Amino acid sequence: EDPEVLFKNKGCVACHAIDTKMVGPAYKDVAAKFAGQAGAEAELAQRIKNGSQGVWGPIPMPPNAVSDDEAQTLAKWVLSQK
Amino acid sequence: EDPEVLFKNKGCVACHAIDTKMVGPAYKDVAAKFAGQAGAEAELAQRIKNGSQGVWGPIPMPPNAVSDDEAQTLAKWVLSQK
Ligand code: HEC
Ligand code: HEC
């Protein structure tokens, strides 16, 4: 099997990242940054779906092929990180 | 859909972790630690399959339900992190 496929399928993602510094911000840090903002869930869902740039650094996030509902589910989950 | 399921299925894992500090060591750090050791791939495959404890801290890694071949594939990939 492809190893990235196994990494996801075999539960490793719960406990490990490739790097302490991934290209995008860690979700716990995203959650903390938004702690004083209402409407974080809607904003993040839009960013997740459509892509975004310039908030955390010069590296863009491309759009993601997710539905509105999927984007909202993911935004809520990012915001649920403790 | 479950959000952890979407996180894996929609490609987010390539660019984000939940936390800069996951319970287990980051794979780039594992790769660097083993740079002077022959037989790292076999050692890591065994750790991945069987679990391990006490190398990085007090939190154990439980066994993972992987085949020998899957464990080797994953060990090789961990070691391929740059
Ligand atoms: C899913 C199959 C994987 C893969 C590929 C790896 N793990 Fe873990 N892991 C966890 C912890 C707490 C540790 C440190 C244990 C200690 O201090 O001894 C590890 C360690 C590793 C390593 C490095 C092993 C070494 O001896 O250097 C590697 C390569 C590794 N893991 C890969 C914690 C977890 C989990 C928490 C519940 C889960 C799930 C996994 N690991 C799963 C995987
Ligand atoms: C898969 C569907 C996901 C999810 C759920 C998220 N991303 Fe990304 N992301 C990346 C980068 C470089 C950034 C920073 C962009 C900037 O500086 O503006 C982001 C940002 C985010 C956020 C925070 C958005 C904010 O405005 O604060 C969130 C919640 C987020 N992402 C979730 C990089 C990548 C990728 C690299 C190629 C990929 C793939 C994804 N992101 C995918 C996802």
Numbering used by the authors:
A (entry chain A), B (entry chain A): 1 to 82
Copy the relevant paper text.
In domain swapping, a protein molecule exchanges its secondary or tertiary structural unit with the corresponding unit of another molecule of the same protein. Cytochrome c (cyt c) is an electron transfer protein existing in the inner membrane space of mitochondria. A hexacoordinated heme is attached covalently to two Cys residues through their sulfur atoms in cyt c. His and Met residues are coordinated to the heme iron of cyt c in its native state.
551 molecules exhibited domain-swapped structures, where the N-terminal Glu1–Met22 (helix 1 and loop 1) and the heme were relocated from the original position observed in the monomer. Interestingly, the active site structure of the dimer was formed by the same amino acids as that of the monomer, but the heme axial ligands (His and Met) belonged to different protomers. We have calculated the root-mean-square deviation (rmsd) for the Cα atoms of the regions from the N-terminus to Asp19 and from Val23 to the C-terminus between the structures of the monomer and each protomer (protomer 1 and protomer 2) of the dimer. The rmsd values of both regions were less than 0.9 Å. These results indicate that the structures of both regions were similar between the monomer and each protomer of the dimer. In addition to these hydrogen bonds, a new hydrogen bond between loop 1 and helix 2 (Asp19AOδ/Lys28BNζ) stabilized the dimer. In the C-terminal region at loop 3, four intramolecular hydrogen bonds seen in the monomer (Ile48CO/Asn64Nδ, Lys49CO/Asn64NH, Ser52CO/Met61NH, and Ser52NH/ Met61CO) were conserved in the dimer. Although the redox potential of the dimer decreased by about 30 mV compared to that of the monomer, the dimer exhibited a relatively high redox potential, which is characteristic for cyt c family proteins.
